[PDB]
């Protein structure tokens, strides 16, 4: 009943590098507009845009209804942004996927935008300091990556998973050395053009076109990634170089009813099967996937093994390999270009970022079912079964 | 097939007033367990909590999971924010309708929560400023209240509707003083008190129990009213008499399929029998309500005579004179408690809070059928049928 | 040689008091006028108007010339402002006076100048934050009142004095009381009226004229003094009661030769015999008068026992009962119109504001001798020998 | 009678260049501890330090101590900062040259430092901002650089200075070039090795010494200056290329008296034979060198065409050549190793870096009388007559 039509990515940017002055809508505009175009279908036929978006302050009213505009989507049609924060992207699909389900709308473009760069600095100052110092405060560090419950960052939690499960400082470098390895790969050859829609940074002194992701290392070694320090736990075991980055970017996906794409002579990316969303310990947040996973494939009627490809998020390589380790899928089938510790990981956007590399994947190599997953701070997961026609 | 179990709703405070320093979460756990005691559901039987905000920045990460959390739901379930400006509050009860509609969860806990007052100024730093005085933002008026393609204030967009459907300023104040007395009114008579759930205003030097409407004024006068000046046109006619607040407060309501109502027992408040979302021209957004309204009713087979009692949101008395003039719906059965203007205007609890006042008068005097709809800041509207069973 | 023609201070503003958000120049240009008219002596007069303040950030270019100007000083003449902390405002008169005597100037205006309320939170901002929270400085903690090698505020000095001098809480307690009985008393009999020159509030909603010292407590109990809490040691000795305040105000004396005064027909509050500066460690920098005194008395020629009265600063009882129990001058001639923890305490003026506090009462009692000295944060102390003709 | 035994300067730090985040203290301390060596003076027989600083906020309590207790100047001496803007740094030495005359010091150490790429940005938050954007002022270009008059920048009075002179586009960037090809030649020959003591900037990653001016530009055509925008008059005269910059340093003079020089042995710098300091209209206050140096020339019973070596501060070269026009010395030599287009301007520091460059070069070549004299923002100018030994 419900497929993605098309889809497009922006390339992630390095945090304050490429698009380190981009706001996230002009991101998302773009990508709106890709995914119009990709599918031969007009803003004009669009009914709502949904963008996932964790942090959005200072950017004004409702960026989703302004990356919508700037697309061209006329004002007749409405937007909102979402946030399940690092599941935003995905969830915005499933919510996209449910407004088609219950007859509300029959086209919708939904996925995540955001810019970590961008993000400001605040203070709540109605009542004046009479005396002594106040913090700024980072809204992305507060807002986005610390635990609301425990004070601590995600890595914090991340090292919980590790010492949890008994994950060596070795084998999480392992771990984000292959995802380095994989998405270089990937890149070189041309796997991530299909997917991504180049971006316009509008200069002054020049327009620059960013269409790669910079912040793939290329020939990441084993022993550059042995001699860095623990990031978040001083006597630690995770580290900057097996810890996803502070990244921006914007993805998303075209949604309609099977028959309209089949009315359009559109060959739809795929069909989405079942999505699902599970709690779990905010302390081991990273464990989310596991539950969602499972349950989204209960939904789908879908065995683990049923599954050609798999793209669950690298938000670390401790929680990635708990992950891996706890389903048992194929490592072989995981994240085949690389994952977010080698692109990036743009909060809000992560979802429909690895949406559509599931999906060009899926094409490519003619897989037939798919699965995207990604841990959520909070201690959340949540997953969605794609099956392509 | 999908009813509206119980509701409650925080008292709506004044800017700056009783909830100056409580960050929206606290007051949204509030009303979150209100719904459940009230309808006699465990915390434990939730699998999602739905919070329309359009102004978290500096509350930490995703305030929908703090709130539930806070208020006994398990670290099973999951929660998730979203805006849609002050559609928000609204729109999560019909986006929690589709998720037990798709078969994706039984019961949700839907509305908006939202602390104007603690909303922080702020200022994009990392580049650092190199010479020159920059500007530190209002994070409410920039993100909430200021248009972002005209780069204008609400109360413009209002002006704007003022001068196109020849709403004089005699007319709007008549308005304004309607809702303070019909406010005060209702409030007199114990009419607000099954809504409102009592907050505790933690302190230090003393515990304040809030169960009042703070933001209503008693003995509003004509004259005084006809004294104010502009507020955004400076020969203008909108003023901070005939303009809603800026103000705090928490709604929600508690959902399940109607039969789940029936195996627990439940009398229910209503079933949801159509919703709907239209956009419209940013300069004109007041009329929002027009387009979504309609549809709603179209979308749920009824005619606007049809309509027992109906809540439009008062965002201003120039957009309030205009959705109803064109509408044509007897004036007597909208807003009878009085409205946002009187009330407040808690801009991601609004849709919330006027759904709350809308249910627990159809109880009250018995009507069977109820619209409820706001204006949404950038051009949209939102609109959703009850019926009482 | 040289002498003291004239003086003038204004009230001293309690803290966002009077003077909340009065810039410390326009407090100076009044104080500027009142030397001037006091002495019979026109601006166009004037060589020189030199102004201790030591928290200016945010007033603009040299504020000491803006009060110049304002008072009408001759854009010919020339204004500087100098810092040496608490000892800013008596230093100021000193350094005015070495004008004279190596013959650069005949006429000089000197005092100091504070707004401690108008003075700013800050931050570095040149180079970005890339990531984190920072800090907003209030610069009047920073810059004012923290002792810049050990990183504490003045009154942890207060508390090293407490306790290297074994002055117990209760004789600190006695010591604030006897202060503002003093002061109040003073207040009440008209003896600040001399002194004071009147400072009108430039208001919108009507102007008020400030004639009083507002921080003066009317009717201090040693029952209130002896429950307060411990302001900077949690188990200390120091409180907000036995410790100056933070304030705001200006002051000065208009200087000149005798042999000019003569000319004129002036009869001078005094002539300046003698002053010194000099160190001490800036963990006991409340001992400062001692050695400054001891040399200022060396260098006039006198003995202890030949003052008349004294104006010893009152920044914290702990170091007011230190350098009298040391000096061991009479206590009944020290500050016998009550001192700055009843006053209160604008760090720059301070210097002048005692000043005139001891050339109006010296001339009021007909004491013939007279000493003004102040403690300064990094480790200093100021003094001055009057006699008078 | 006063002799100046030695000098010492740091070389121009750019903005926010080799000294970006270096506080001035720092900078102070090394020129502090360079002048005692230079001397063969022990930082124990120090009486005091005076140092000139304009834009201290946030740098913590009087820097100028800071400076001394780094620099191992006794506790038991005392220190200050003063401020009479771009002349501070004379002043300074002015002021300390007071203090010996008068008798109430020995031996001094004074100067001025800056550093302007630490200045902050400020509010006053105190009373608290009820809504709205505000204003985060830089505080370099608010108290260091704006007229309080006037409220426009030190360069607009540069516009006013070059129409009232009638001095063209043209005429002031060869003036602007011939500044940098001589600060060019003389670095590159060596003439500022023996003013300049190196500067360990403290790294982390490694340290940095530095000595060499880099502000300075090599290779300085009339092509590129002629081709630049006016800065501060969208249709002036004044460029970035003809006006001083923004920078960073420290510099100072060590002072006692020609007999206790002629006691220890040393061969001094000079005497210092006369300083004046006189006021102009604010709106020409480039023109302030002019009546100062007029002033301090018949207090020396000097005749200009009596002096053999002269600096006069570059603040604009609009002023600089209306200083030259009216005063009428011979240009050869004015500023013979460059001035401050090419050097750079730390305002609290400047006179007494042009000091030092003063006192090397009469050293150097053998010239007997010189002079030092800068213009002061407000109006004002300051001088000062050197005669070797
Ligand atoms: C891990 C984290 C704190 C690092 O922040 P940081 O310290 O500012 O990061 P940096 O990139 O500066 O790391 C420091 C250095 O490590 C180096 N580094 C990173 N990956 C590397 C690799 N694979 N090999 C070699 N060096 C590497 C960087 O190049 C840099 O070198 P430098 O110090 O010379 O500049 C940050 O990326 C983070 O919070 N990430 C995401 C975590 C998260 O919770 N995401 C949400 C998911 S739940
Ligand atoms: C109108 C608005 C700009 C007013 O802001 P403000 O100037 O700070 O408001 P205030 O409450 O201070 O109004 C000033 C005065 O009006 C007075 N006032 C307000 N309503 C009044 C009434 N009915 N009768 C008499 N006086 C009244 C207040 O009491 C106050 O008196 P004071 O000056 O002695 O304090 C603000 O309410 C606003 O932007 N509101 C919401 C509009 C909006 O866009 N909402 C989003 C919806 S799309
Ligand atoms: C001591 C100090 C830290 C107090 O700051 P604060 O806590 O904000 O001060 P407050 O005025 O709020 O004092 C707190 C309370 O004590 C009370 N208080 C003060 N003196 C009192 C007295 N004599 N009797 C009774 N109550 C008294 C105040 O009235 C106030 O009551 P409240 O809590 O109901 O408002 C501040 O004055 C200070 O730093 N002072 C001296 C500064 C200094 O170092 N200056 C330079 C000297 S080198
Ligand atoms: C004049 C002023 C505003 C310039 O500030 P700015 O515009 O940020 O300065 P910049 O140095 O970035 O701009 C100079 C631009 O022209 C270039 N430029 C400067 N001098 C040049 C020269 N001599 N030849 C060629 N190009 C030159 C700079 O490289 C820069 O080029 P870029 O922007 O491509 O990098 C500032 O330096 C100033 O305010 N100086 C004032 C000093 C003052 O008032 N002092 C107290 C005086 S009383």
Same mark, same amino acid.
Request: glycine share 12%.
């Given at each position: 009943?419900?497929?993605?039509?098309?889809?497009?990515?922006?390339?992630?940017?390095?945090?304050?590098?490429?698009?380190?002055?981009?706001?996230?809508?002009?991101?998302?505009?773009?990508?709106?507009?890709?995914?119009?175009?990709?599918?031969?279908?007009?803003?004009?036929?669009?009914?709502?845009?949904?963008?996932?978006?964790?942090?959005?302050?200072?950017?004004?009213?409702?960026?989703?209804?302004?990356?919508?505009?700037?697309?061209?989507?006329?004002?007749?049609?409405?937007?909102?942004?979402?946030?399940?924060?690092?599941?935003?992207?995905?969830?915005?699909?499933?919510?996209?996927?449910?407004?088609?389900?219950?007859?509300?709308?029959?086209?919708?473009?939904?996925?995540?935008?955001?810019?970590?760069?961008?993000?400001?600095?605040?203070?709540?100052?109605?009542?004046?300091?009479?005396?002594?110092?106040?913090?700024?405060?980072?809204?992305?560090?507060?807002?986005?990556?610390?635990?609301?419950?425990?004070?601590?960052?995600?890595?914090?939690?991340?090292? +919980?998973?590790?010492?949890?499960?008994?994950?060596?400082?070795?084998?999480?470098?392992?771990?984000?050395?292959?995802?380095?390895?994989?998405?270089?790969?990937?890149?070189?050859?041309?796997?991530?053009?299909?997917?991504?829609?180049?971006?316009?940074?509008?200069?002054?002194?020049?327009?620059?076109?960013?269409?790669?992701?910079?912040?793939?290392?290329?020939?990441?070694?084993?022993?550059?990634?042995?001699?860095?320090?623990?990031?978040?736990?001083?006597?630690?075991?995770?580290?900057?170089?097996?810890?996803?980055?502070?990244?921006?970017?914007?993805?998303?996906?075209?949604?309609?009813?099977?028959?309209?794409?089949?009315?359009?002579?559109?060959?739809?990316?795929?069909?989405?099967?079942?999505?699902?969303?599970?709690?779990?310990?905010?302390?081991?947040?990273?464990?989310?996937?596991?539950?969602?996973?499972?349950?989204?494939?209960?939904?789908?009627?879908?065995?683990?093994?049923?599954?050609?490809?798999?793209?669950?998020?690298?938000?670390?390589?401790?929680?990635?390999?708990?992950?891996?380790?706890?389903?048992?899928?194929?490592?072989?089938?995981? +994240?085949?270009?690389?994952?977010?510790?080698?692109?990036?990981?743009?909060?809000?956007?992560?979802?429909?970022?690895?949406?559509?590399?599931?999906?060009?994947?899926?094409?490519?190599?003619?897989?037939?079912?798919?699965?995207?997953?990604?841990?959520?701070?909070?201690?959340?997961?949540?997953?969605?079964?794609?099956?392509?026609?």
């Amino acid at each position: 009943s419900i497929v993605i039509a098309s889809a497009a990515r922006t390339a992630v940017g390095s945090f304050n590098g490429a698009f380190a002055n981009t706001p996230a809508h002009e991101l998302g505009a773009t990508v709106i507009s890709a995914v119009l175009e990709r599918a031969g279908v007009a803003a004009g036929e669009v009914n709502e845009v949904i963008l996932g978006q964790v942090l959005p302050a200072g950017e004004g009213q409702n960026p989703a209804r302004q990356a919508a505009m700037k697309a061209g989507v006329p004002q007749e049609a409405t937007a909102w942004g979402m946030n399940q924060l690092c599941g935003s992207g995905l969830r915005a699909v499933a919510l996209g996927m449910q407004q088609i389900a219950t007859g509300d709308a029959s086209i919708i473009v939904a996925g995540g935008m955001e810019s970590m760069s961008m993000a400001p600095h605040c203070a709540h100052l109605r009542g004046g300091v009479k005396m002594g110092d106040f913090k700024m405060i980072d809204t992305m560090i507060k807002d986005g990556l610390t635990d609301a419950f425990y004070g601590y960052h995600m890595g914090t939690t991340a090292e +919980n998973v590790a010492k949890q499960w008994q994950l060596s400082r070795d084998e999480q470098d392992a771990f984000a050395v292959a995802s380095q390895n994989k998405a270089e790969a990937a890149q070189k050859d041309g796997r991530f053009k299909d997917e991504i829609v180049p971006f316009i940074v509008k200069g002054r002194k020049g327009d620059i076109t960013v269409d790669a992701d910079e912040y793939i290392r290329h020939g990441a070694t084993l022993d550059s990634m042995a001699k860095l320090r623990p990031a978040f736990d001083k006597e630690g075991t995770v580290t900057a170089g097996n810890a996803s980055g502070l990244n921006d970017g914007a993805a998303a996906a075209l949604l309609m009813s099977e028959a309209e794409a089949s009315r359009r002579g559109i060959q739809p990316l795929g069909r989405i099967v079942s999505w699902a969303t599970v709690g779990v310990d905010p302390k081991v947040m990273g464990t989310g996937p596991i539950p969602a996973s499972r349950k989204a494939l209960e939904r789908a009627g879908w065995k683990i093994g049923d599954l050609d490809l798999v793209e669950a998020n690298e938000a670390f390589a401790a929680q990635a390999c708990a992950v891996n380790k706890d389903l048992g899928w194929d490592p072989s089938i995981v +994240n085949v270009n690389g994952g977010a510790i080698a692109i990036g990981h743009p909060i809000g956007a992560s979802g429909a970022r690895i949406l559509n590399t599931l999906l060009f994947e899926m094409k490519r190599r003619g897989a037939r079912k798919g699965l995207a997953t990604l841990c959520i701070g909070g201690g959340m997961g949540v997953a969605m079964c794609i099956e392509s026609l």
